[PDB]
Amino acid sequence: SNALFSSRDILEVLQDIHMETGETVAIATKNDIYLQYIQIIESVHALRFHVDENAIRPLTMSSNGWMLMSTMNDKAIDNTVRRANTITQKDGIRFEVDDMMARIRQVREQGYASAEHIPFVGGGTICVLLPMTIQGQPVTMGLGGALDRIKQNYDRYLELLLNGVQQLKKSDSFHQ
């Protein structure tokens, strides 16, 4: 019942990270074991991520995924990695429950996630968990672009995401 003022708070923060970084920026949540985008703002760089929305993407395949999985219980993470392997292995990719469960525990610890070449060669991504939930689901804010641009701006980009989180500690969770 206050969904719009929260969406606006989030959009304003996401617009700031887009202005300062020029990268593809997004808010995402989970849909069962798949990553769901709520809002994407496309990069202005020549070489960029063009997010195809019809794409089905398991949570094991992106740093946004690991951040979202880090919110589940272990029973649910194990099911997720297992179920997700049967899908990604149709393309020869499959993470060992052991190491994925380790990466997830680390991400939960350090407060954010980043990834090189995952899901895509030449790409780099960094994301954080937003303080609020949307429709009972946890929510993520992240940026993506060409790996080199990401590597060379890593500390600055991270800092902006984390500070974006601080700016939203006054925004409500909503079920709309």
Instruction: Please list, in sequence order, all residues whose beta carbon lies within 8 angstroms of the beta carbon of residue 87, skipping any fewer than 6 positions away.
Output: 58
Q: Report which residue type is found at 130.
A: L
CA atoms within 13 A on the CB side of 125: 27
Q: Which residue has the tokens 């149709």?
A: 90
Q: Residue 141: name the closest of 156, 126, 123, 157 by CA.
A: 126
Query: Are 168 and 12 within 8 A, CB to CB?
Result: no
In angstroms, the Cα distances linking 74 to 14, 80, 93, 97, 150 are 31, 10, 22, 11, 31
Cβ-in-10-Å burial (0-12, 13-18, 19+) of 71 comes to: middle
| Architecture of domain 1-176 in this structure | 2-Layer Sandwich (3.30)
Q: Report which residue type is found at 152.
A: Q
Backbone angles phi and psi of 48, in degrees to 5: -145, 175
Q: How far apart are CA 29 and CA 134, in angstroms?
A: 8
Instruction: Please list, in sequence order, all residues whose beta carbon lies within 8 angstroms of the beta carbon of residue 67, skipping any fewer than 6 positions away.
Output: 107, 112, 113, 127, 128, 129, 140, 142
Strand partners, 144: 24, 125
Backbone angles phi and psi of 54, in degrees to 5: -65, -15
Q: Residue 147: name the closest of 169, 130, 131, 125 by CA.
A: 125
Task: Please list, residue by residue across 41-69, b when 16 or more beta carbons sit within 10 angstroms of its beta carbon and e when fewer do.
Answer: bebeeeebbeeeeeeebbbbbbbbbbbbb
Query: Are 130 and 165 within 8 A, CB to CB?
Result: yes
Longest pairwise C-alpha distance within the chain: 45
